[PDB]
A paper describes a structure:
Endoplasmic reticulum (ER) membrane resident P5A-ATPases broadly affect protein biogenesis and quality control, and yet their molecular function remains debated.
In the M-domain, we find a deep cytosol-facing crevice, in-between primarily M2, M4, and M6 but partially lined also by M1 and M8, that deviates substantially from the cleft identified in the E2P/E2.Pi states. The cavity, together with the arrangement of the soluble domains, renders us denoting the state E1. The identified inward-open crevice likely represents a critical aspect of the transport pathway, since the opening is overlaying the cleft of the M-domain in the E2P/E2.Pi states, and the cleft is lined by E458 and E462. However, the cavity is blocked by the C-terminal portion of the P-domain insertion, with residues 1005–1013 dipping into the membrane and inserting between M2 and M4, hence forming another link between the soluble and M-domains. Moreover, the apo cryo-EM data yielded two maps of the same resolution, where the only difference is the relative position of the P-domain insertion relative to the ATPase core, revealing additional flexibility. The observed ability of this P-domain insertion to block the likely transport pathway in the M-domain lead us to rename it the Plug-domain and the C-terminal residues of the domain (residues 1005–1013 model, but non-sharpened maps suggest it extends beyond D1005) the Plug, the significance of which will be discussed later. P5A-ATPases seemingly rest in a cytosol-facing E1 state, which is blocked by the Plug domain (green). The closing of the ER luminal end of the cleft would then push the helix into the cytoplasm, and following release, the cytoplasmic cavity is capped by the Plug-domain, as observed in our E1 structure.
Author numbering: 3 to 119, 125 to 356, 365 to 521, 526 to 590, 597 to 767, 776 to 887, 1005 to 1143, 1152 to 1285
The structure:
Amino acid sequence: PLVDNPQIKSAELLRPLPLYQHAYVWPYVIVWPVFLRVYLTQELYDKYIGAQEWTFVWIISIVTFQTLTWLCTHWSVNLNALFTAKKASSIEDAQLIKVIPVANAGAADICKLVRDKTNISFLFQKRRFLWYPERKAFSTLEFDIDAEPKPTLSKFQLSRGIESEDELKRLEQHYGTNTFDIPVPTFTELFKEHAVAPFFVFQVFCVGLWLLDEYWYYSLFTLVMLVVFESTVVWQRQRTLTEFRSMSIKPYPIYVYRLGKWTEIQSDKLLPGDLVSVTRTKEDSGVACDMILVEGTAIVNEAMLSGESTPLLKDSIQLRPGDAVLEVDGLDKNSLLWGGTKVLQITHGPASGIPPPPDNGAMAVVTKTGFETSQGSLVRTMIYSTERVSANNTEALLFILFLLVFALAASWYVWDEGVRKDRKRSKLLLDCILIITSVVPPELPMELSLAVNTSLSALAKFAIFCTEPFRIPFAGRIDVACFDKTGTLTGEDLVVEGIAGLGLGHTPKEADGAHTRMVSVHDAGMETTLVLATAHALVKLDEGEIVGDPMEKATLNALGWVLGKNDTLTSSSGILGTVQIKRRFQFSSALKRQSSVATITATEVKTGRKLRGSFVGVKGAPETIMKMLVTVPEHYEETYKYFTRRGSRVLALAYKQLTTEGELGANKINDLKRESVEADLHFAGFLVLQCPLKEDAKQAVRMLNESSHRVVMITGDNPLTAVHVAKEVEIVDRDVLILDAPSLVWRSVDDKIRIDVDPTKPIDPEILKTKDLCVTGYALNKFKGQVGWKSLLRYTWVYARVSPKQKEDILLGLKDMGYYTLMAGDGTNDVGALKQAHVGVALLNGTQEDLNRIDEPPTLKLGDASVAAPFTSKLRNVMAIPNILRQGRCTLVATIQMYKILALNCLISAYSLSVLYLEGIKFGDGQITISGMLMSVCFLSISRARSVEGLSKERPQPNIFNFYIIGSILGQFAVHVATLIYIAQLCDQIEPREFKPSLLNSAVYLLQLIQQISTFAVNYQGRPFRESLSENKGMFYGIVGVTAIAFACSTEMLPELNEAMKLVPFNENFKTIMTTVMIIDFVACYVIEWVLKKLFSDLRARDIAERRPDQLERERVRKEKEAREKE
């Protein structure tokens, strides 16, 4: 019924049908008595043959058709909807619904409708959908905080919880219980699920078919090898499900204000709208569900959602305008308690008029319960991480069908040659079906999953964890690698340079008139010291730790003052005073300033000059305070521009006195508007800070730029700092031009070129050709949708001063052009941007020494994955991005080599069987068993390979169908079939014509063994991405031993081993011809594969990542210098 969800493609309504009308019952009920009448009494042998073997063939064919029609319902959902069910009229009589998700959301499934009263609902991927008759469509549940019009704060500030019992029952029926429902099945249900998959039943059918031809050991070996693998997979899945269940939070008693009483209920019956009391959490516990603080403040530790153990600070919405302010999740982000955090402290113990709870805790209001929380969604998307097996297999099936044509040609030729020589039709058909069925590889469509699960183990050694593992192949096709700033490229070990520009209006100067004289923070004025000690937002734990932004911690450490009990600072500095913060206005990231009101009492030791009373301190961006001053100085703009042009961070300080003596009063300070306070300011000075670059930034950017990628930067600072950082990190090289309002004029860094451009006209080609670009946020906003917006995303690499919405806007605009993007951020400022990109990395702040003191990868506990981005690195190194880009590049290479090996093996086996069956002879049982065991040994021995220590300019192919895989497969197959035809013809020329040994059997067996080893030796993907064949002993010895064994059996070094495989002894000349033919075959295969790899393997870089010859020359001379300095 056209459900409303971005992750669902279509829907349909069905009704169930009785067992009589199922499509796998009634036609067989019609046709079986016809066959019984024909076989029993009718004697209509015209459409028959007569033998018992043909009766067996007819019975097998009928049973096979019936069970195939039955299994087609389990294999696909469309045939399930067609054969068993049938379409209904509308929602009034339908009982079943079919849901088909988006291309990478899982597998389609038939969902059952459940009706409760009027309400129609169904469960899809553990997510509840509801039927809204006013919209005539299905959609997910709607909560009070996620309405299309955002509710005001008067909804939550005056909330009184649940007041009626029928409302409680309605909420219980609507939203359900607050728990994680993860049902774990037993071994029987999982093996039933695994035993109906098409490839398992196909392998069972192949085993039965081989057993029909009197092969007792081969079928048993295949059955054992299949059964143990399936049992291992089922046991691993069961263990993973048990571990997933084990992480659910246990219920604990809590206080809920229900029906006017503070009744104690368990934490398993929370409903959206309840008024719960938050207290300090116990050991092995946490917040039950998402909340919003309505009174008091709390200090939390969100280590189960972001992977960081740094304490935070959360504040209530108690002191906000109740109805005049619409709730926004950009300014009120410090009021929501997420489900899974641990509360560490409660500071205080109301507008709603509610008596305090008995436990003396903060009051909150529940918003989301169940899987609809954040960590609930993370758990749900980690349960269904196997989207690589279900929403896939659309190209491997085509590869199997492509091999089936080469199978059918040989089978048809064998049948046509057999019908003209008067063969028995009960054996020729079996031989043809064996030739057909010996082609389909059983482990072909699930190669990508094994490669991904192998790469995930190597990634989990540098503390890099992946939540959605289908993005690993996406990491090998990256063209644009976007970067952030202040969380990725630059660290957080800020150092206070000093206070400069405080001498204005009262002297070294430059051409522009800037004041370069800089004064240390110790020898500063009293007002500036009071502003620095007033306008912070630091709070102290009872145990002695200080929490907050590292900027405030750094400036407090540089100031020298100490932090007291309750927002009181005393005092090395020469101020010798005390302050007490009354009211605090928080930073908003859009007003670009923060302010505070405090009571001061200072006594300067140099000139006395007592000062006491109310005080207002504000600290923010220098371009915003200038709009709030009363008299700007003579050289304000030039001074702050000069001090920010060198990569330093400049903040302005302003102060205002309210009362020269005496308190303002609690009632006055409790009721003050932000706009009235932040006006009529004085000037104190500038605070200058230097953010040091990370140690790995330059190397990890120089590796990305020189390996067919492109590195852009999307920051949020002023353009001068962004340009300086990009020049230090070597992103831009030539002269840059900043596009910003002065009109959207072009500006230079030194402000010597001012070129105006109109947004309707296209930009100048010379600007795009001879200069680098830095596009701001305002200019990009004024270029939205016009003709120049397509060429402003291909020639710009530094985006400065952009909102978090514009980041995902830029990422979407870059994705819509066909490029693949990567986003690396801190995981807090931008959340939608990290998910809009193809692959997103969230670089945390943990050091290596923190990790020191504290097969698929270890299953992700709640402290390992992050809710912001799919990938997550627990180390702060920038080098974590090339590791991902190298693993995602080696995965494609491994997949390509396995695809090239399996098809060649199958095509060799089929055309060996076709050559043998034209003469009437057949393989021995021991020979084929030894061949299978040796092939399995070689497969085990070849899989142990590792990667190189650096990136490469050559990119691998991303898909099967190209001019490299197909050409190599065809060439090697043609060489092998010509070799086999020549050997068969020579053996027929030498000796003219129950299992007995013969010359042709031994010759064909030896040739096919040698070819099946040569296709392992030749088709190994080596040098550029992974370790070479000759480097490691593990596969070299394995190949050499089996090659020597086969050659020794060929030339009769050990005649005792010959009788194990039933080989007729040869003479000298035939041995010489066989050895020469083997060597010629190997050399020709190697030459063809090397030529095709040298010609067609390289996938060239895009137009956005191509370098100029100057950069190539600089890279060459830098590599030459490094090679010279290596010794």
